[PDB]
Design a protein around this ligand. Sequence first.
Ligand SMILES: CC(=O)SCCNC(=O)CCNC(=O)[C@H](O)C(C)(C)COP(=O)(O)OP(=O)(O)OC[C@H]1O[C@@H](n2cnc3c(N)ncnc32)[C@H](O)[C@@H]1OP(=O)(O)O
Ligand SMILES: NC(=[NH2+])NCCC[C@H](N)C(=O)O
Ligand SMILES: NC(=[NH2+])NCCC[C@H](N)C(=O)O
Lengths: 166, 168
Amino acid sequence: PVVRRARTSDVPAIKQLVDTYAGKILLEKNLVTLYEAVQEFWVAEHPDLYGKVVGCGALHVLWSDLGEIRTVAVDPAMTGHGIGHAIVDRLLQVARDLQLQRVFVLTFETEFFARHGFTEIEGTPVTAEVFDEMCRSYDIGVAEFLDLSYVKPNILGNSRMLLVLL
Amino acid sequence: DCRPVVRRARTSDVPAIKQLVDTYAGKILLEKNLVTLYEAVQEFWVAEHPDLYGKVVGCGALHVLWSDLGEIRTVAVDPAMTGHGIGHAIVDRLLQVARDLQLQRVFVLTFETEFFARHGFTEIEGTPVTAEVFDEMCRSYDIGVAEFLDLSYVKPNILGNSRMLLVL
Ligand SMILES: CC(=O)SCCNC(=O)CCNC(=O)[C@H](O)C(C)(C)COP(=O)(O)OP(=O)(O)OC[C@H]1O[C@@H](n2cnc3c(N)ncnc32)[C@H](O)[C@@H]1OP(=O)(O)O
Ligand SMILES: NC(=[NH2+])NCCC[C@H](N)C(=O)O
Ligand SMILES: NC(=[NH2+])NCCC[C@H](N)C(=O)O
């Protein structure tokens, strides 16, 4: 499937994908914060219909060398057609374009991301000096990566996976 | 005089960007710590130094605020390189990406009224969004959005600044 960069017109559709997977699975993102993050988002168009989008995804930078894959959602009726994998394949390519070395994921979909080289891990792989700089973030997804105390109850059960690049 | 290359930022550029933002502190620019610069690297732009290959002498960023609305934020140039056309080369680029995003209006909160005027910006009053959108935008964790909404707790941090806007 075609994986293209998101457009402000795509936000209402993107919002519906995130809301579909609610807050237990995906981290909720309100309408404004999606319009602000539109420049790092990607969407998969339906293989036949030109306009409609069936999947979204975003690469979030966390530091000099570290990136994250977040807010990956596919229409419940379109899963198992390779869409989600087509999104990750491109998201990882832009991670390369960004000269990143490690890509993080916090998810229940261990099997899904495993097919891209992701291995499950424990802890936060950053220096305490770097850890201290990231505590200063206003972004919740960063806090879930740092396993900060005030987001812990929202992410128990999720697995921490990581990918290294050539 | 030379028009400098204005390219997308790279994670290696963030430390340099951090010194430019820090240079203009909180009196002029809204301060941005190191992590939020690495997170925003995909919307940031930098002007390369006409002489040093790696180092950057100016930065700038376009932040989308809604379907049609964008903002230009954290635009800074080295004090020793000011008045050499860099900042306008950055703004010219930021506005081009606003078009590629199919935006219609671009907002600015600044003291540099004449600077942005050279691009067609006109001064305004208030927050130009529907009250329905205003309510959706109140939910943001970004301080720059709160300053666009003229929220009460940031008022003392922006007193004196002018609100300008550009239409495409
Ligand atoms: C974040 C926001 O949204 S607010 C943005 C404002 N930020 C700030 O003011 C931070 C403090 N100020 C600054 O950092 C700087 O003033 C900047 C980065 C905004 C602009 O700096 P520079 O680009 O280097 O100055 P620049 O070379 O573009 O020209 C400044 C003036 O001199 C003129 N100009 C003078 N000489 C030249 C020249 N050789 N070439 C091109 N333009 C020139 C410009 O036309 C311009 O006139 P204008 O203000 O009426 O448009
Ligand atoms: N708040 C949560 N339920 N978080 C679980 C992990 C969310 C995941 N990191 C994402 O991309 O959305
Ligand atoms: N210190 C402030 N918040 N000043 C108000 C203007 C902020 C400026 N537009 C910026 O992007 O940084």
